[PDB]
Design a protein around this nucleic acid. Structure first.
Ligand SMILES: [Mn+2]
Ligand SMILES: [Mn+2]
Ligand SMILES: [Mn+2]
Ligand SMILES: [Mn+2]
Ligand SMILES: [Mn+2]
Ligand SMILES: [Mn+2]
Ligand SMILES: [Zn+2]
Ligand SMILES: [Zn+2]
Lengths: 163, 365, 365, 163
DNA sequence: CTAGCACGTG
DNA sequence: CACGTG
DNA sequence: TGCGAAATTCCATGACA
DNA sequence: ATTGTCATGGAATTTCGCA
DNA sequence: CTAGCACGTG
DNA sequence: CACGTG
DNA sequence: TGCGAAATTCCATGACA
DNA sequence: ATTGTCATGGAATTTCGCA
């Protein structure tokens, strides 16, 4: 009933394990619901601790109303609940064995996994170092359904690194 | 010989006729209401003025008074000031009585990421083995990122900025000429990403004012939060960084976060006015805001200010002068006036240099 | 309960009737041109204002904006400022936006030796094993003595001043609160000679301005004379001291030596106007001069200055605050106003203290 | 033909040897001609060197047109001449075996020697320390021929230490 | 009261 | 040895 | 009894801390 | 329970030299 | 960029 | 190791 | 369409260097 | 071959609530 805004929901999963690039094995994927903006964080494991550490970075920049995830141990710990409560973030969960992201996000992690794959092919253990560029692309790829890329939706400006 | 004609009742341009000039004890004198003074030849006045001056290396009137205790000649001060403009010792040691031009209030960067400002706060009381904070302020918005480092390294700057560029790449990055910003390692890191490095004029932190001024609210908040408590600032940086990016600037009536996104995140007392609007309907309004913002005007020029002119003789403040050492380099020439507050000169080491007029004085006389 | 009557169409002083107040989701709201805001009970406003404030420990309007993103109640700023005047963290950390009163231009001491000014210059580049200079400026004249010492000892001060008192004994000796001046050894040395010790307010060198300003012309001359030359200032002190005592002050049109003696010594460019006069005829004129001198007027009070009133709540600048430590002591009370620029307070350690308003700010709110 | 001023002539002799008070044996006496103002300087010997050192102190405060002395080796050295020349001071000498000071000065060194004597009696080896006070008295004793003490003639003001 | 320190470049 | 003032 | 030039005075600025 | 000061050099102003 | 140092007192 | 900038 | 109070705005001051 | 800035709180001002 109310038009969707950035920060209204942040979606996560992990994507791993991957080949050890400089010591990092998993990747915490954060995507904004409305803009489709994406933050990646290389973590050494999909523990709540690596998750908290990474989101502690994000939640310095912005804080979402809802964090939507699946039922990974990383996301369903008592700790993680206590973590979200302190910051006023609501935790919504996808029903187990039934991903309930959204069309925009569905294609987004699609776009990310497809993006990540190229790196495994091209750069066998240099993927870590390139997470920023990936993140740039993901945030600079245009959109069909919307005429805009996230970097225009999140900031309202053309990027100085378009794709 | 020039004075011989005075004694022959002849008029000489500058020597008033009404006065009686005469000889006494081998010297030409003149009865003045001041008293009886000596009129030395032109050939000795340069020496006399030098003699009087070098007593205390005194200024104009202070040197004139000395001379006028004994001598008189037409336009003494002309013969005085001529040497003042050549006593290197006074030129390089004496302070200026001219205030700089009025400050520029440069146009606020148009969009976010148009220009970053970067600076280092520190050293600080070691918290978690960290000492410095790399502050990154976005020009347009003021949205600020705070990265803790162990040293003002080139390394720590890149290793932090990469995390930031991940979000977005900025056109220009502005900063003082600190070692980590002026290094080749960084210059090149910027080139990989098509980032243009802008550099503030040296010994002029107000040029990085955007960030220095943010340094205050950062330090000031840190201070309030550590009252009656040990100084462990590391665990507080994010807290501050969020807290500050969402703190209204009463003049604008917007917060840096707002200026960057157009909507509040899930922070306390979050503004919900755009909740009815669509993102487009709300993203349009943000484009208007960013332009319809407030722009400080250039302040009135000081009653006795000085603005630099090409070719004009000027000197540059000595950076760290030793104890009992002159605070001004020898006079240099103005090559190019970048603006009423910035100048290219020809420095004392025979180099091209861009300095703020704050570190210049117009060479007197 | 107070809000219950609003919903019963009853008017309550401060709640404008024209507005429609109602209930929604367990909260009393009000449709404003601002938007729809919540009217919390009085019992929760103190907490709410505290909640908003503690985010960035923001000032008035910055805290108001936060609250006005959600709530509305009559005279929010009153409920805001009430807490601002009690958040110790902000009171002790925030800077002042009030400039001090305009400076006093105290009457120049009437005769020579009415008041000395003493100060220490240094440390300096070791010359002849010496590091400091004890400067003694005569109040009335400005006649200055320069004594080289190895340390700012009480000893070196006495061992120098005895040579000076040999010439004459001064009524008052003025000085900052440097260890050598505040020691019992010196206090007592002054008592033997019926010298009254005057002491400048702490962390306020302009109170010893007479001498500090002389420190300049001393350092400045030393600098000019050591250009392109090692820093051996010891052998030059007398040279400077003579040179300076006989250097005209253009405003007065007299030199310190002149003001002290009424005639020039055998120095270069010596004024001979009183040569016809007898010493009496010339000593009379000197009494007229010393009185007919020039007196600087008190400058205009700053557009937003503050003058101290007895009983008023004020705080004292922390001398050396540590890194990330508040720069203001807790609020103190004004006990006695010695003058529009000097105050006796009750310091943070429960002591009587005399401070210059330069190191005070009026406690805000 | 021109009325006498302070600094117009400074008269010197030594007065010594005296009992070793803290190491000082002689005393260089400087007296201003016109005011009768007196400066004493304890020197370890009446060499030109001690004389120069002491006058180097005085000539920081004021510089006299003439320095008038007797023909002591201290005052007639080539050095001392070169010393006075550099500062523009003229050196006048009393004819040997014939003191040519002046009435004011004659009585002054009289007043000083009489003053110094009291110290030898009272304080056998503490005279050094009291040179300042002596100097104060000498400069604060009134005068017959003139209604004033030197400290009023040299400065034009009443002293804050009168006698 | 003014000395330090850090960094990166020849 | 710490604190105040410089 | 005025006019132009020259000498004096004013005064903001900065440094001493 | 003490207090800003003054050398400096362009500019503003007053004074001076000559009718 | 901010740490020092000096001194004299409990 | 010294110099520049901070 | 005016009046008093309340809310907003102005802005000099200081700190970041 | 670059450029001061902004949170702050009394005061000045503009706006608001009610006729
Ligand atoms: Mn998963
Ligand atoms: Mn810096
Ligand atoms: Mn001092
Ligand atoms: Mn003899
Ligand atoms: Mn001092
Ligand atoms: Mn800085
Ligand atoms: Zn000079
Ligand atoms: Zn607070």
């Amino acid at each position: 009933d109310r038009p969707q805004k950035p920060f209204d929901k942040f979606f996560i999963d992990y994507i791993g394990p991957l080949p050890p690039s400089q010591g990092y094995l998993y990747v915490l994927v954060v995507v904004d619901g409305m803009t489709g903006f994406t933050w990646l964080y290389p973590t050494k494991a999909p523990s709540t601790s690596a998750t908290v550490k990474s989101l502690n970075v994000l939640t310095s920049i912005a804080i979402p109303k809802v964090i939507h995830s699946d039922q990974g141990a990383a996301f369903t710990s008592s700790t993680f609940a206590e973590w979200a409560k302190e910051r006023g973030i609501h935790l919504e969960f996808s029903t187990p064995y039934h991903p309930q992201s959204s069309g925009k996000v569905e294609r987004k992690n699609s776009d990310i996994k497809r993006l990540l794959t190229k790196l495994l092919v091209g750069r066998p253990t240099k993927w870590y170092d390139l997470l920023p560029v990936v993140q740039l692309a993901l945030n600079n790829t245009y959109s069909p359904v919307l005429k805009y890329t996230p970097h225009q939706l999140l900031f309202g400006i053309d990027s100085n690194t378009p794709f | 010989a020039e004075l011989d004609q005075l004694l022959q009742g002849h008029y000489i341009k500058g020597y008033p006729k009404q006065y009686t000039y005469f000889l006494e004890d081998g010297k030409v004198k003149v009865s003045r209401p001041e008293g009886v003074k000596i009129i030395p030849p032109q050939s000795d006045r340069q020496k006399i003025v030098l003699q009087a001056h070098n007593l205390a290396h005194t200024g104009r009137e202070a040197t004139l008074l000395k001379i006028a205790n004994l001598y008189w000649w037409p336009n003494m001060r002309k013969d005085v000031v001529k040497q003042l403009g050549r006593c290197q010792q006074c030129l390089i040691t004496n302070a200026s009585n001219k205030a700089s031009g009025p400050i520029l209030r440069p146009d606020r960067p148009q969009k976010p990421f148009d220009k970053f400002f970067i600076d280092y706060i520190g050293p600080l009381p070691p918290s978690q083995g960290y000492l410095y904070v790399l502050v990154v302020v976005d020009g347009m918005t003021g949205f600020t990122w705070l990265y803790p480092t162990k040293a003002p390294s080139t390394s720590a700057t890149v290793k932090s900025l990469n995390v930031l560029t991940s979000i977005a790449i900025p056109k220009v990055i502005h900063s003082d000429q600190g070692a980590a910003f002026t290094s080749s390692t960084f210059a090149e890191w910027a080139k990989e990403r098509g980032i243009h490095l802008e550099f503030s004029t040296p010994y002029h932190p107000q040029s990085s004012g955007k960030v220095e001024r943010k340094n205050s609210d950062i330090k000031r908040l840190l201070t309030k939060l550590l009252v009656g408590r040990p100084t462990k600032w590391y665990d507080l940086l994010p807290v501050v960084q969020l807290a500050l990016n969402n703190t209204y600037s009463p003049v604008l009536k917007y917060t840096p976060h707002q200026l960057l996104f157009g909507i509040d995140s899930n922070t306390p007392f979050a503004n919900q006015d755009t909740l009815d609007l669509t993102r487009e309907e709300e993203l349009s309004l943000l484009q208007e805001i960013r332009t319809s913002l407030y722009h400080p005007s250039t302040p009135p020029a000081s009653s006795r200010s000085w603005s630099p002119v090409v070719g004009q003789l000027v000197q540059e403040r000595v950076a760290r002068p030793a104890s009992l050492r002159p605070r001004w380099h020898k006079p240099s020439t103005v090559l190019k006036v970048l603006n009423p507050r910035t100048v290219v000169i020809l420095d004392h080491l025979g180099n091209n240099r861009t300095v703020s007029i704050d570190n210049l004085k117009p060479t007197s006389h």
